Amino acid sequence: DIRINYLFTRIVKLIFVELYCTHTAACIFYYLATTLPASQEGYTWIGSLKLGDYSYSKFREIDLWTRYTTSMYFAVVTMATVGYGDIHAVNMREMIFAMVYISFDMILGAYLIGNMTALIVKGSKTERFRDKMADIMRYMNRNKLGRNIRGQITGHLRLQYESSYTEAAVLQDIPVSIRAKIAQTLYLPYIEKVPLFRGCSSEFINQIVIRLHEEFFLPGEVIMEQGSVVDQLYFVCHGVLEEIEIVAVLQPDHSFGEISILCNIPQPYTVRVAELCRILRLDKQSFMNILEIFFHDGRRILNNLLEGKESNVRIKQLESDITFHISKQEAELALKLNSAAFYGDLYQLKSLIRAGGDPNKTDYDGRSPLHLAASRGYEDITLYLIQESVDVNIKDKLGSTPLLEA
Amino acid sequence: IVHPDNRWYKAWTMFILIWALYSSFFTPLEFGFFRGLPENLFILDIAGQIAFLVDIVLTFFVAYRDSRTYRMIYKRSSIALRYLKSTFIIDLLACMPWDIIYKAAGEKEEVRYLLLIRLYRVHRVILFFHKMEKDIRINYLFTRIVKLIFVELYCTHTAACIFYYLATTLPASQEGYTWIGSLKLGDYSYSKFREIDLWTRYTTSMYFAVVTMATVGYGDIHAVNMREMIFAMVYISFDMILGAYLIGNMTALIVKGSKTERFRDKMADIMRYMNRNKLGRNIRGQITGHLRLQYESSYTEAAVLQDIPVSIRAKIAQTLYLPYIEKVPLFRGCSSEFINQIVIRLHEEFFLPGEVIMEQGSVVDQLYFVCHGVLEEIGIEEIVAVLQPDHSFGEISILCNIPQPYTVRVAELCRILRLDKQSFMNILEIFFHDGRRILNNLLEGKESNVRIKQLESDITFHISKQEAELALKLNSAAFYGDLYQLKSLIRAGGDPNKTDYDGRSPLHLAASRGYEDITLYLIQESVDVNIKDKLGSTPLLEA
Amino acid sequence: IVIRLHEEFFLPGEVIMEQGSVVDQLYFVCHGVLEEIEIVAVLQPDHSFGEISILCNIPQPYTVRVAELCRILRLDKQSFMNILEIFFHDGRRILNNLLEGKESNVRIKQLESDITFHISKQEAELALKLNSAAFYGDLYQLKSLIRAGGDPNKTDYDGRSPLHLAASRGYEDITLYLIQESVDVNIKDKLGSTPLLEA
């Protein structure tokens, strides 16, 4: 069973076995005393016993208990290698059982130590915590870091130990790339609840979840400074973050840093943690790529920002930049489609066809994807457009035809 | 007024720790060796409770850190409500005086049994070891030994006081059955068993408990009664489990060792092999010195600095490496955020003087930045190139996919900042606007570079396809005649002197719709007025 | 060649190379006795075996058996067939020892004929691959065929100086070195052309 510990369930077994052996030895040891006739009971280990004023003269018909507790007390003393000397073997037969029991218990006694030190050799939670600070401390003071950053690191590391959990450090790293399935199990509910992703396609969300990360922040820390560009995207999952006198408070199921990740304007506000927060992060470079491929989905995302801008922070300069992209969004669908066929892309081309507009529509000058596909003779891609029943007599604004350049 | 962790409060906590130490060791003495309390010790009993009584009222005015939000609650009703449900039920009971009550309520042994409740307040001492255990400045082997010794020496002291109590339950008529009433060590009769002394009575009882705690068992003092055997088996059986725990706990810490002990073993093994063949006289010192530097500089690769969040990790990167990168000649003119990205992946490396970084003809798969010392390049052995600090090397080899043709060796203690080659194009590819600048810097720097480069590389091919893709939007923007986005597009590195796949240019499309408003901007942008497409169509003809 | 060696042991009674099997390694005996196979010969230390088959590509015609405990040095065919390919002058003299050794033991007329062809035309191939090196603009290993090679002025079979190919692709980073050797520029092939005309 995994609920109980591994070595602990083994330590108790050794203790019970060791305890049972003494009980059996004590019962047998009294039997060796009564194997002799009562006339010569004085040669036994109990027949000649005298502790205080009790004589043990008869050694029989005394009682069950005081006859037993005196035999077990002798056995338990021998087992623990104490050897008071109150009771000792007197007979030849009791001597032979004496070394047999003593020699065997020496192996068992040394076996209990070996099992239980292995329970300690496994790193304790505080044992690894001390060693981890020792490694970073020698690196951290070697470079002579400032005192302000000293509080941030040590306090953050203590959070991992104090709150435990954290799934160790590498988490195992043995799990296969099926971690995407686990990522969609926990991070999905917090993602769909954000206001910015309202109305976005589910598949687009299903792709952005697998690249998230889990981070914590202690109260009083500063994540983004004043007038500094940002390279990440943060979604608040738990806790309260405060933006800066104060301006606003960010309740959970909110995201910040989007004004500076789209319009390239440096972030004009400083955010500060007010309560312990579980915060999800994203990389700017990876997030920007998924918007380029999802041209139709990305355009609708800016609509929420424009609506959100009107409600709070109008941002006329940002609105003007956002308006230009949405206004010409319908044209760029076929504009990069021509470039897609020029380089013969296959896997991501279908995304702009299955989840895109008409490939028949040309660009500004007039250039069907069939024109560029046959320009370099990419026969591995030309066969697909006939499945879409694209016309062959595409008259561009040059007097040419898709067959002429082939 | 509420003081969460005031300096004055910490002094008070240590003061009450002394009282907790005193009252935890004195309670067994009063319970076992005494029947009541003599008038000589009345003042001590009263003073002991008053010291703890103040802690009961003073603990309602102390803030605590919330276990869920770490907010330092400070709420008046929250501090009180927390304490009444945690400890106040049992702590108040201990502070009650029981010597007076037992005397007042006639003389009954039943009430005096509950006096053992005061043994709980030894938990303050255990908590003190727990706090001191977490401190880095205190040796871990030392604190674990002290805590284990104290937790075992206290049990022995408690067992000694209980043992003498078991000998007092028997009436004085049959005192010869007890383990001590029949004692005779030398010529001391030990007959009376009472009104002998407090110290001679205690030191013989504790001498018995210590002897049996270490599994010695002299046998002069031993259990004789029936109620003393039962307690002897319990204490002995429980001791051997705790006794083996001290051995097991110290064994693990010795087995673990330290970094230096493991490092010593590694040098011991190699020295035996190196001395086995009796090879080298100066080589022996050279390899030994290199290994010493390896352990001394074994701190840049900090595995601890991996769970730290990237936002904190980024800040510590720019405070060390950034002042040494922004002034590199190769990285002149690049945008600020591009340098901020390459500074994250930089790695530290130390090199002992006299050794070689890379050899002639070996394909370069890592980019190196010079940060300290001096570097000497040797080729033939003649030295013609010297690498001064703040100068990069090996960049040309990676870009031109040519093996290094002129090896370099170090002459003085040099710190080299290493950048992985595999992690260099990927950042370069996503940043193509400034990627042209570093290529132009390379060409303008050297007199001829390497045949003015040769392209035919994934890095060089992709940057061309990305920049051409950018100009496609610029070409489309000029078609619609939206001058508002033209200035912004060219502001962020947009080059009007760019050609799309089909030979077209923004100047060509400017005359397509007769947009004279944007035509003069292109002239001010210094565009080729007679640029020809693949079909040889000049912009004038198109107009 | 030393820096690429490896040390391996072999207990007696083992077989290193079977009968009629191609060989991928070169073995030098350091200590011990090797038996070649009824028996044919015994290999005392300071000898090398597996050398006839590595060059002439003929499968190894003998079985090598470890008579007594031996520690031998090994090499790799891929990492050895190139070090003598770039050492054109040194590699040719190595075959001379084999030819002298072949006459003393194992004449190998078929192997001798193949070896004789390479040595006979070894002087011409010095400049033949020299032009190819200048064609691709090699720098580090090119000097080996100059510092430890023949005259770059000598042309190939058709007649083409390295200066001709140096200016063919405009490798200005390599053309400046030729003047240091005082190579002529009026070098004419059997076409009436000059290196300047090609540039």
From Swiss-Prot, chain B:
Segments on the Cytoplasmic face: 63-85, 134-147
Annotated ANK repeat ranges: 467-498, 502-531
Induction: In roots, strongly inhibited by 2,4-dichlorophenoxyacetic acid (2,4-D), abscisic acid (ABA) and benzyladenine (BA) treatment or by potassium starvation.
Spans within the Extracellular topological domain: 35-41, 107-112, 169-203, 224-227
UniProt main location, coarse: membrane
Listed transmembrane segments: 14-34, 42-62, 86-106, 113-133, 148-168, 228-248
Record-level GO BP terms: potassium ion homeostasis; potassium ion transport
One cellular component term from this protein's GO annotations in UniProt: monoatomic ion channel complex
Compartments in which it is found: Membrane
Amino acids binding a nucleoside 3',5'-cyclic phosphate: 330-445
Other comments on record: Loss-of-function mutation skor-1 leads to a reduced shoot potassium content.
Name of the protein in question: Potassium channel SKOR
Species of the source: Arabidopsis thaliana (Mouse-ear cress)
